[PDB]
Symmetry: D2
Subunit: 124 residues, 4 copies
Amino acid sequence: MFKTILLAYDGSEHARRAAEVAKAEAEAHGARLIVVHAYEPLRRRLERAEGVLEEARALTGVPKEDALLLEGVPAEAILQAARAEKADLIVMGTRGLGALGSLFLGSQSQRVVAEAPCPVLLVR
Amino acid sequence: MFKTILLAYDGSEHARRAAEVAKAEAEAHGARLIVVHAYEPLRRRLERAEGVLEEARALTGVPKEDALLLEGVPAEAILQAARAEKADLIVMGTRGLGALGSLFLGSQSQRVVAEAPCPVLLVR
Amino acid sequence: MFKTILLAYDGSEHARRAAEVAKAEAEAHGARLIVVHAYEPLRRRLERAEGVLEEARALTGVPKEDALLLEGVPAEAILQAARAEKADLIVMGTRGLGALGSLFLGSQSQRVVAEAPCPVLLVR
Amino acid sequence: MFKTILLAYDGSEHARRAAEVAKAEAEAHGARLIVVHAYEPLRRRLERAEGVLEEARALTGVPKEDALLLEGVPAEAILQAARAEKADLIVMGTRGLGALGSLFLGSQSQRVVAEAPCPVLLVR
Ligand SMILES: Nc1ncnc2c1ncn2[C@@H]1O[C@H](COP(=O)(O)OP(=O)(O)CP(=O)(O)O)[C@@H](O)[C@H]1O
Ligand SMILES: Nc1ncnc2c1ncn2[C@@H]1O[C@H](COP(=O)(O)OP(=O)(O)CP(=O)(O)O)[C@@H](O)[C@H]1O
Ligand SMILES: Nc1ncnc2c1ncn2[C@@H]1O[C@H](COP(=O)(O)OP(=O)(O)CP(=O)(O)O)[C@@H](O)[C@H]1O
Ligand SMILES: Nc1ncnc2c1ncn2[C@@H]1O[C@H](COP(=O)(O)OP(=O)(O)CP(=O)(O)O)[C@@H](O)[C@H]1O
Ligand SMILES: [Mg+2]
Ligand SMILES: [Mg+2]
Ligand SMILES: [Mg+2]
Ligand SMILES: [Mg+2]
Ligand SMILES: [Mg+2]
Ligand SMILES: [Mg+2]
């Protein structure tokens, strides 16, 4: 099972735990791992986003072509990449940088769980 | 990663897909797999519940001592078993027998996601 | 505004607060108030359900023809009555008898909020 | 009932419907109505935010001192104003400008529903 795994990374402590889990899943299933980081609607925003994505590439060890910067609402970006890469599993945190502890699950995780093309592994 | 995996099984088509995923995860991580099925508050209810649990034991191949019938609100039962068995991953469906398609995620999955002691793998 | 108001009543302390709010809204808007209580799939279940509905009729003062017992998943029952009675506002508790405090909003309120034909007033 | 009503306004079509409902509720209950619009973390952001708040003041007719610009995560801002103004009812849309139709309820409405000091009237 699981030939392609997609990690959604936002640089939060939950996403660093999710990156560890995704690296472990890819090794255990012999899968190809893709990491993605979305930025929302300049040079400054892209520099910041590239650095966050660099961190995800460093924690997972994936090749450059498998670490993607995407633009837009995070969940939409994650879902489009997942359909494009034919992901069999999406790994993401239950919460992220914007956590206040008032939602039961972060809004981008909620959206992905509702529309995902495959199983989603939520990491606390 | 993942030494103990807990599958929450309600006999729905989502939970049969979740049982396949949990069997595959346990084999890939060399983990011990526990399957649980909760029944809500007689002889008839227990007979029905034992049969549903038998199906989960047949699809996963776990030993008898690792297939548990529990009582109460499903999510509470799942969470207590998970803390008791020191589960490192809970696998459950996004929806179950009571699905109407109006919730974004079933209520028992919502409760587990909010209170789980470990990552939760949601299977559609 | 609001000519017909529907109260969804389950006999919980939240629903008793919601009944007070619904009585106050109906008086303030000069509206017709309907109270509904759903029971899930005998003589015993119906006796219990009629008594809960009697309590809602006593707290709101509505006429008998405007206090309805319905069957099925609560939210489905509430929504069908609301479309049937052309309700302009549904008043219900944020939580109910089955509250464990783990959901952000009870599952029947979640379903109604997602599919309602009109505004929904959530009472804590 | 309801002596102080707080409308959370984001300039979306749902919030314009919510403003109509809030104006009608304030008139029916003889209540004081407060409208609030939050902006997230310059001159440009404040100009845009003041114009959105002007629209809410125009649709509800409230006095200047009762139309407030607030800063921060919207739900936090709404909740703090509600405790400060001792609001007895918060009226807000089920969805807003960022709606994609994938959440069951928008994230700021979710947060307010979970932490509100009073009933919340959700307007579709
Ligand atoms: N820009 C982004 N790029 C990639 N993944 C993202 C992302 N934003 C969020 N995620 C993923 O979603 C997970 C859950 O975070 P989410 O953004 O849903 O909640 P949050 O705690 O930040 C509150 P909010 O719903 O207001 O954003 C993160 O751990 C991460 O895996
Ligand atoms: N009695 C039970 N025992 C074990 N697991 C259960 C269970 N009930 C539900 N689950 C687990 O929860 C998953 C999601 O189903 P859930 O019960 O949350 O939603 P549902 O679609 O049945 C609507 P509802 O929230 O009304 O019950 C199921 O696939 C199963 O893994
Ligand atoms: N059988 C029923 N008949 C009428 N209204 C009901 C109902 N069950 C619930 N409701 C309405 O829904 C409100 C919220 O309760 P809800 O049932 O959604 O959550 P809960 O706290 O009971 C946990 P659960 O989702 O497991 O049932 C109740 O206050 C009541 O207004
Ligand atoms: N900046 C803001 N100021 C005041 N009220 C706001 C607000 N943002 C949202 N709201 C209120 O919340 C309601 C629901 O919108 P919400 O922002 O929760 O969902 P949304 O559809 O914009 C998706 P998202 O959760 O990504 O923002 C809006 O109709 C409005 O009443
Ligand atoms: Mg976030
Ligand atoms: Mg169920
Ligand atoms: Mg209930
Ligand atoms: Mg239920
Ligand atoms: Mg919004
Ligand atoms: Mg957001």
